Structure formats: structure tokens, C-alpha cells
Amino acid sequence: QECAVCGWALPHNRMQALTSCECTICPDCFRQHFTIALKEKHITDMVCPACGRLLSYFSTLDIQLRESLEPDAYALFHKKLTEGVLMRDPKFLWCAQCSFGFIYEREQLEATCPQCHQTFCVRCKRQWEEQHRGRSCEDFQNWKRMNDPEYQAQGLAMYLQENGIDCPKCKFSYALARGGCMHFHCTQCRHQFCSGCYNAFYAKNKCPEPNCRVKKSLHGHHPRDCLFYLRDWTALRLQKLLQDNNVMFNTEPPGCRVIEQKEVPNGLRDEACGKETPAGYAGLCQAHYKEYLVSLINAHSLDPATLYEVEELETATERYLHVRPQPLAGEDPPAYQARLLQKLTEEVPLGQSIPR
Amino acid sequence: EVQLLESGGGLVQPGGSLRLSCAASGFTFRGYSMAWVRQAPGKGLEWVSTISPIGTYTYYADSVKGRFTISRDNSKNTLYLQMNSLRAEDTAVYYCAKGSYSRGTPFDYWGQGTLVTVSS
Amino acid sequence: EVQLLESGGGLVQPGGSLRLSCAASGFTFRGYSMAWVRQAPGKGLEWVSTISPIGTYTYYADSVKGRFTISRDNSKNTLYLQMNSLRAEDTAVYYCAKGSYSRGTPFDYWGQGTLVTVS
Ligand SMILES: */C(=C/NC(=O)c1cc2c([nH]c1=O)CCCC2)CC(=O)OC
Ligand SMILES: [Cl-]
Ligand SMILES: [Zn+2]
Ligand SMILES: [Zn+2]
Ligand SMILES: [Zn+2]
Ligand SMILES: [Zn+2]
Ligand SMILES: [Zn+2]
Ligand SMILES: [Zn+2]
Ligand SMILES: [Zn+2]
Ligand SMILES: [Zn+2]
């Protein structure tokens, strides 16, 4: 082998192989010929110096120009490319698979990396597959996530983690399930709130709620459809509220695999819940299965008061209306029940800040 | 030699606005992309935004899209970051960074950094 | 949130060995390529190596290819860099980097860095 403009005998690996014309050129003549064309000729003069051989050429030539030229010479190449050819900055793409950067000025939505020779969508940067043809990137991204075996193996744990906990004070989002503990502590803002209804957990004598009888205790106030109360329901009764409104729920899966955060010396460690997964609980523990049912209940704005008996309606009346109810003359228990239910649903809405 | 100096950081109330600046020197400003990266408490670096040599293309991390605006004044060799609707999670040291075209290095130098904190 | 913690940097003699680790959390580790970069004193950031999501492919800078070996354990969400026959030029702060599918950058997160000094 030898350089095609000066004849210098040199091995193939020690010269620059022009990807277009395949002329072998020494580093010195390559570097000298292309910098003089930038500083004294025009952009069209940057053909090979040996053979005299538009946008794909510059896209490939930019690679070899970057390694051989000087920084100020490489900048003049982008300047003349912008001011003489493109009227704008060149579209520079970064390969997500091999971290190589390259100019891509073609019409196709699939770019082939000049380094790792792998093809990717120029807008979502994921590796190109035939399923992406004629499909939005979100449809394609959803197709891969819903065909990833290890994502499906997680089961409903992903649904509980996707529905995250947003701090009502500092809006910091946590991609965590609630579990059985409702008293949440935000590390960023120190605000204490209920993860089910986002109401404040008040310190001693901080609660402003009227007729509160636990003012001197750490506590919060919850709407009747908050997980704080609905966690005490049986899974059967929670499913009954769902069935009465034609809301489907899983009982079979599609140690509990729900990810929790254990505080360790090195910060926070992702630990699995690992509690018992009873039959009919979709592979989750008891607390996370009830959390899954209550999330479906909350998402559809189902009212648990529709299943209240008389004693439950009296408790709700004293709790949310601050009045001990009294049966009226001529009322039977059904009429007493309907009156209490009507007044409760009219005056006391469901959780106004519950994530639905 | 490359020198980058950020300014404009400070204490911001939630939902407030703030404009960062970055005076650059020691290289051809127009010849390179410029980027902003940030160090959240207990973290390393998170890419925020990148602007092309003459501002043709502006890229943003998902968490700042629609709230942040990157810009540059090539006549002054200054990079700008307009930050709107700031949240507590935006609290970080914000670094100015000189872009690069080499493999695996979207930027090769980043400055001293200006601290932005968002109260709660 | 995303977290990348490097460990394993220290003082080593020329010709020695050193194994760096990168503990990752806050994102599906197996779905992204991972990389190592470094910054020598007074120099610019230099790419070292990149490994594909499940480790099928590895890429190296010419100065480190063969001496360095990148690997990953997706079951533990950890990225490794085995550095053999360390030279004085390898003295740098080594950063762990997460591959990005966002337009405008090959990586969207870097770690805090670990300092390696070769005599
Ligand atoms: C009681 C519920 N709280 C939490 O689960 C919780 C989780 C995190 C944080 N704060 C919390 O209050 C901050 C950092 C992220 C994880 C759970 C409990 O204490 O066990 C009984
Ligand atoms: Cl890109
Ligand atoms: Zn020659
Ligand atoms: Zn030729
Ligand atoms: Zn590639
Ligand atoms: Zn796409
Ligand atoms: Zn908060
Ligand atoms: Zn509650
Ligand atoms: Zn109270
Ligand atoms: Zn569980």
C-alpha cells in the first residue's frame, strides 16, 4: 500500500481510507489538503486530492475530518457547511448503543450508526425493528414494554409503583407503592401527609379541624374513600363495591414482588416486600392487593357509602357532619338508612385530593 | 485554555423564575454546541439541555421540557438558561459545559457551577 | 431518581490492577447501555468504554482496548470496569454514565466520580 497523492509507502492501517473513492491517503496529505480547502478554497473543493471524486458525502467525510484536522480547522468546516450548504447547523445524532456521534441529513426516520452499524429511530433513538414501521414511537415503546417478559413477570407490582406518591407540598414524586403505612414523610420538604388522600398529618395541637378529639396526638383526617379506611375492609367487600359498578379486577397474577425502600447506611436500598402471596390476591400481599383494589375504587370514584349499614352511616354522620343522627317518627331502618346516605353524599364529597 | 463561568444562581420560591448566564472563553464559541448539566443533592450530573452551534436545535431533558429555555449570544460568547416554574426537584448546582463532537463526550469541559435552591 | 455511585478508585503503582464498580438505581438497568468516561487533570473528558444493555457488545477507546474490560451484572444493577496494567496516563477521575434515548446526548446521567491515581 501507498498514499495515492505522494506515493509514501505505508501499511493500510496507517493511512486514511476514503470511504467514498477508497483511495489510501497518508495522514499528512489528508490533513494538509482539507485544511487549505477550508481556509482558501470553497466547500465544493473538499473532494479527494488523488481522484477528483452531496450531504451523505459530508456526513461520512465529517468523521475522518474530525480525527485528522485541528480544532480550529474542524470549526471552519462546520461554519462553511452551515453558511454554504445547509443554511443551519447540521443535524448531529448520538447513537444510544455505542455513544458515537455523527451527522445525519437524510429523509428516513431510521439512521444507521457509522460506528456500530446498528439502526435506530431518529426521534425515539430506540433500536429499529419492523414493528416500528408505520407506528408512533409511543406505540412502539408500549409494544416493547408490554412484550418484555421481565416486565410482565413483575405483575401488578409495576401498576402499584407506576401510580406514584406526589408530595402535596413540594410536588416531589416517588415511584412507590403505599403498602399498609399511610403516614408518609417527604425527605425533600419534611411535610407529613397521608399517601392515600394527601391530607396533612398534624403534630400535637396543630390540627385545625373542628370538633377534633385527638388534637394532642399525631394524626390526620381522611375521606371515607381513602385507603386509610378502606384497608380495613375485607378484600371481599372491596371486590363487592367494584362488582356493583362493573369494574374488573385481577385475582390471579397476570414473596410479594412490590419494591419498597429500606433505609440503610448507604442511603436507600430497593427491597422486595416479600410477604405472603395468598390465593386470589393476584400474587401480592394482603396490603398491596387491597391497595390495588382501592386504587381501582378511587380511579372510578366509587363511593363506599353505598354499602354502608345504618351503624356505618351514623359513624360517618358524626365524623364528617359533626352531628349525632336521630331517626324520625315513622321511619323504618331502610328509610333512616336512605336519609343518612342522601345527606352524607350531598354534603361530604369523596376525597378531593385522592389520586384517581 | 477553556474557561467557563456561571452566574445567576440563588434562592427561588416555588414556581418562580430564574435566568442563568455563562461567560465562556478560550475556544471558538460558535464552533461548538453548549450544554447545561446539574448536580442534585447526593447525585453526580444530570443532563439538562443542549444548544447547537448557532442555536438551530435545542434539546431538553424530559423533566425540564416546556419550563426551561436554552439560548446563546455568540456575539458575547455567553450561554443562557431561562428557568420557569421552578420546583423543589430543580434544586441543584447548574454547570455550564462546552460541547464536543467526539465519541461518548457530548461535552469535554464544564465550569465551576452556580447553586440554585428552591424553597418549599 | 437515577443514581450512579462509583467505587474502587485509589492509588496504584504502574502495572497494577484496579476494579471499579458502579451501583445503579432509579431506572431499569437492563434497558440502557452503560459507559465509563474519565477526566485527566487539566484535560478534557475522555470516553473510555461502552457496553450494550445485556452485554452483547462492548466498545473501547483505542488507548484502553485490551487493558480495560467493561462488564455488567443486570441481576445486581451494577456496572464494572476491570483496569489492568495501569499506566500514569490512566490517572483521572472516572465517571459512570447511563445511556440515553433522549435526543441531543448519548448519556443523560453521570455519577459523582472516583479518583484513580497511578504513580
Ligand atoms: C409508613 C409509610 N411511609 C413510607 O412508606 C415512606 C417511604 C419513603 C419515604 N417516606 C415514607 O414515609 C421517604 C423516602 C422514600 C421512601 C411506612 C413505615 O414507616 O413502616 C411502618
Ligand atoms: Cl441525538
Ligand atoms: Zn501523502
Ligand atoms: Zn480518491
Ligand atoms: Zn452506534
Ligand atoms: Zn421511534
Ligand atoms: Zn415534599
Ligand atoms: Zn388518608
Ligand atoms: Zn384532628
Ligand atoms: Zn406486598
Numbering used by the authors:
A (entry chain A): 697 to 749, 758 to 958, 968 to 1069
B (entry chain C): 1 to 120
C (entry chain B): 1 to 119
Which of the paper's sentences describe this entry?
In addition to recently identified inhibitor (1), which labels the active site C885 of HOIP via the α,β-unsaturated ester, we showed that analogs (2) and (3) represent valuable small-molecule chemical tools to target HOIP in cells (Johansson et al., 2019). Ligand-bound HOIP RBR/dAb3 structures were solved by molecular replacement at 2.1–2.56 Å with clear electron density for the linkage between C885 and the beta carbon of the unsaturated ester. Inhibitor (1) and analogs (2)–(4) are all based on a bicyclic scaffold containing a pyridone heterocycle and are accommodated in the active site in a highly similar manner. Inhibitors (1)–(4) all engage HOIP via hydrogen bonds to the backbone of H889 and H887, as well as through aromatic interactions with F888. In addition, compounds (2)–(4) engage in H-bonding with the side chain of H889, which adopts a different conformation in the HOIP RBR/dAb3 complex compared with the HOIP RING2-LDD structure (Johansson et al., 2019). This additional interaction may account for the small increase in labeling rates observed for (2) compared with compound (1) (Johansson et al., 2019). Crucially, binding of the dAb enables ready access to stable and reproducible crystals of the HOIP RBR domain that maintain full access to the active site cysteine and therefore are amenable to soaking of small-molecule compounds.
